């Protein structure tokens, strides 16, 4: 959309993980793994875990998850 900067992508990544655990699409085994990984990602790029709501707002990715976005990507391999 805009530029797909590290912060733009990061927000969608953590949002995707949040979506998975929300509707419980993963077992508690991997749930805690993504739980901590999400925080590591947040610290790496320099943003708060609970600040994802603001990032999705300031960026033009509101109402869009990494899943739905990729789901709309009809990449055709012309190998």
């Amino acid at each position: 959309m805009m530029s797909a900067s590290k912060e733009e992508i990061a927000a969608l990544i953590v949002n995707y993980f949040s979506s998975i655990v929300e509707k419980k699409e993963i077992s508690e085994d991997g749930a805690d793994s993504l739980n901590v990984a999400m925080d590591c990602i947040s610290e790496a790029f320099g943003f708060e875990r609970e600040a994802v709501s603001g990032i999705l707002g300031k960026s033009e990715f509101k109402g869009q998850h990494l899943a739905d976005i990729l789901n709309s990507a009809s990449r055709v391999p012309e190998s």
């Binding site: 805690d32 793994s33 739980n35 901590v36 590591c40 610290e43």
Partner: protein, 81 residues
């Protein structure tokens, strides 16, 4: 034997790295306690250890740690919740 050699390394700056020998009868909680003793952490709840992506819970014993000469490094994650 009882000599459980583990390497504690923090991925987030400052990236410290210390090696010590523990016991198979010790739990992940013991490592956390040890980390605080070495003045590398403040609270137990801030210390979240991981191994090959698998989160090491306090109830986990060091005897169940799948640590080999290759992955003898434990991921030390420290965050205020």
């Amino acid at each position: 034997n009882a000599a459980v050699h583990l390497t504690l390394k923090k991925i987030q700056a400052p990236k410290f790295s210390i090696e010590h020998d523990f016991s198979p009868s010790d739990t992940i909680l013991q490592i956390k306690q040890h980390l605080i003793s070495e003045e590398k952490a403040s609270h137990i709840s801030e210390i979240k250890l991981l191994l090959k992506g698998k989160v090491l819970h306090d109830n986990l014993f060091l005897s169940d740690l799948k640590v080999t000469p290759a992955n003898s490094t434990i991921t030390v994650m420290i965050k205020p919740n």
